[PDB]
Design a protein around this ligand. Sequence first.
Ligand SMILES: CC1=CC[C@H]2C[C@@H]1[C@H](c1ccc(O)cc1)OC2(C)C
Ligand SMILES: CC1=CC[C@H]2C[C@@H]1[C@H](c1ccc(O)cc1)OC2(C)C
Lengths: 237, 237, 9, 9
Amino acid sequence: SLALSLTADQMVSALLDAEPPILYSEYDPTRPFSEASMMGLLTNLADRELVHMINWAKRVPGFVDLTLHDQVHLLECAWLEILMIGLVWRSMEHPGKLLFAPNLLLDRNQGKCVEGMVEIFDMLLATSSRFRMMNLQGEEFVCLKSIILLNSGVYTFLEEKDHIHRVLDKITDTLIHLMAKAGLTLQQQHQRLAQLLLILSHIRHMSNKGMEHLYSMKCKNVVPLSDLLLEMLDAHR
Amino acid sequence: LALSLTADQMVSALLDAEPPILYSEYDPTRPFSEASMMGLLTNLADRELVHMINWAKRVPGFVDLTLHDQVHLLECAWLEILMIGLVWRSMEHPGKLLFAPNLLLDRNQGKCVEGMVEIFDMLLATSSRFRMMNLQGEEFVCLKSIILLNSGVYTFKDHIHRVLDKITDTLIHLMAKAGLTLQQQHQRLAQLLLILSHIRHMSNKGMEHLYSMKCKNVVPLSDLLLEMLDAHRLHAP
Amino acid sequence: KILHRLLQD
Amino acid sequence: KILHRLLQD
Ligand SMILES: CC1=CC[C@H]2C[C@@H]1[C@H](c1ccc(O)cc1)OC2(C)C
Ligand SMILES: CC1=CC[C@H]2C[C@@H]1[C@H](c1ccc(O)cc1)OC2(C)C
């Protein structure tokens, strides 16, 4: 193998390099918002983001070693979690704002244009707040993101799973390594490591809730989602 | 007080707080139905709820929270906490879910309720993960405490985070005294908390399922379950 | 709210 | 399914 064969800071670099770009929306800023324009804008964006993240998943150590069918499964489970923590990450330094895109910066009050969406914004804002309290770093974030990809689908899949757990461990080592040389005490390393991974629990929740909101919006036929969106969505039920 | 407790005093206080294992009213010579099963296990969940409240206020630093905090925390985590209990109880019965010492359900008996078999599957996969990982009673009570304090904390708390840090120290304490090396400690701690993310997932699936059983009203639910249920927002097409 | 009371009691 | 195509490509 070769995922097992990286150094701690060879892991970080590979992940930093693998990062997908940041996309703009097609948002005409001279036009105010309605529910249908909102969803449209936000779904159009997520759809274009989906292509990059897939080509990003192929560049995360170990993933390509997994069978095609196991790769599909991990993606179907985590896509919105991954979209979400990315969103949360971009917004970190925009208190009270959600940066869906550099040209699409949403105030929590704007979330109300879409029915039911306001709760989801509040959670996403809080997570972003949390990242700020904790002063989350880029190197850890990319580690967290990879964890989500490898961890969310795994317990619903044959020791293909064992390999996934080895890379999970390698990503833990990596995170500890970062905090160690960030000058953290041994105890301060455990606590932070736990604080970070505990957040993923809330991110799972946001994604579950969000998923249902999307299904809701499609049933309502308020906006037509792309055909990738509607597949990623139907994977969940 | 919670903060100035030694790791040892933490583990003991938690082991003594453990709720008892309850029994089903299930009478074995009677056949099952989507109604009778749902009746048996909401009857069981409803009596278990009463003991969970108790255990909650015996968790160090929990009585220290405002009563509304207490409420919010429990409204958020109640099903996760029943689930991690379930999963832990079914550990030494692979392939089966010990809801009650006289209510051992296998994979096939989940078909009895529509939409139940997939949550059954996730649940079996989790206890299987626990057993495979060989989780210890002492580690289990820590995990359970973590869910109670962690799940709602982001939808409101330094106090809660400091307590959460104390439980993390204790988890490591346990590993360090079980012989695990330093990297083994932090890897096991990652694998543990990563599983809490799955439990959160099952909780959202099962909550949607419960609301589904209310919606097609296959069984009258109790006043408490309905309150629990209504602290979350849901739907059913 | 039953919860509130089971918690205060 | 579009995911499978994109992935194997
Ligand atoms: C288009 C969407 C509809 C419902 C969900 C998921 C995404 C949308 C989203 C999230 C992150 C991102 O980078 C792009 C869109 O967030 C919400 C509105 C919560
Ligand atoms: C009665 C239920 C219906 C749907 C969910 C929640 C509980 C049930 C449960 C779990 C633990 C427990 O101690 C009591 C009931 O778990 C499942 C079946 C997954």
